Swiss-Prot record:
Post-translational modification note: Methylation of the KIX domain by CARM1 blocks association with CREB. This results in the blockade of CREB signaling, and in activation of apoptotic response.
Protein name: CREB-binding protein
Assembly, per entry: Found in a complex containing NCOA2; NCOA3; IKKA; IKKB and IKBKG. Probably part of a complex with HIF1A and EP300. Interacts with GATA1; the interaction results in acetylation and enhancement of transcriptional activity of GATA1. Interacts with MAF and ZCCHC12. Interacts with DAXX; the interaction is dependent on CBP sumoylation and results in suppression of the transcriptional activity via recruitment of HDAC2 to DAXX. Interacts with phosphorylated CREB1. Interacts with CITED4 (C-terminal region). Interacts (via the TAZ-type 1 domain) with HIF1A.
Source organism of this protein record: Homo sapiens (Human)
Role noted for this protein: Acetylates histones, giving a specific tag for transcriptional activation. Mediates acetylation of histone H3 at 'Lys-18' and 'Lys-27' (H3K18ac and H3K27ac, respectively). Also acetylates non-histone proteins, like DDX21, FBL, IRF2, MAFG, NCOA3, POLR1E/PAF53 and FOXO1. Binds specifically to phosphorylated CREB and enhances its transcriptional activity toward cAMP-responsive genes. Acts as a coactivator of ALX1. Acts as a circadian transcriptional coactivator which enhances the activity of the circadian transcriptional activators: NPAS2-BMAL1 and CLOCK-BMAL1 heterodimers.
Involvement in disease: Chromosomal aberrations involving CREBBP may be a cause of acute myeloid leukemias. Translocation t(8;16)(p11;p13) with KAT6A; translocation t(11;16)(q23;p13.3) with KMT2A/MLL1; translocation t(10;16)(q22;p13) with KAT6B. KAT6A-CREBBP may induce leukemia by inhibiting RUNX1-mediated transcription. Rubinstein-Taybi syndrome 1: A disorder characterized by craniofacial abnormalities, postnatal growth deficiency, broad thumbs, broad big toes, intellectual disability and a propensity for development of malignancies.
Result when mutating W83A: Abolishes interaction with ASF1A
Taxonomic superkingdom: Eukaryota
Stretches assigned to the Bromo domain: 3-110
Ranges for region Interaction with ASF1A: 80-98
Amino acid sequence: KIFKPEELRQALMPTLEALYRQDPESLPFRQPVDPQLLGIPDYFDIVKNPMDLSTIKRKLDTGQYQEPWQYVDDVWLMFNNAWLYNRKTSRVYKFCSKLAEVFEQEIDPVMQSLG
Ligand SMILES: CC(=O)Nc1ccc(O)cc1
């Protein structure tokens, strides 16, 4: 199963768009966490591989995902980073959980169609 870059992008983009359409829940995830601006030097000590929606979109737009599971991995990386670093009742954690709910709903039929 070799994937054409534009077809992989076309099949996956709606799942990413669904995340972006979540307002306010996507908002903390539409751009990278910047620990220097936020003044949180511990962030990169906990989150070794940062990920966010803007980076996932750029990768999806620029043929950086050869296979669908690589995209799925990055989305889960984004979620797991947020759930690891932040308090359970924090806004970011709660918002993350909503995006995860949406993603789990969107991704299943898409991954089945691709496979
Ligand atoms: C997605 C995320 O982890 N955002 C975030 C983390 C720490 C902070 O102090 C402010 C925002």
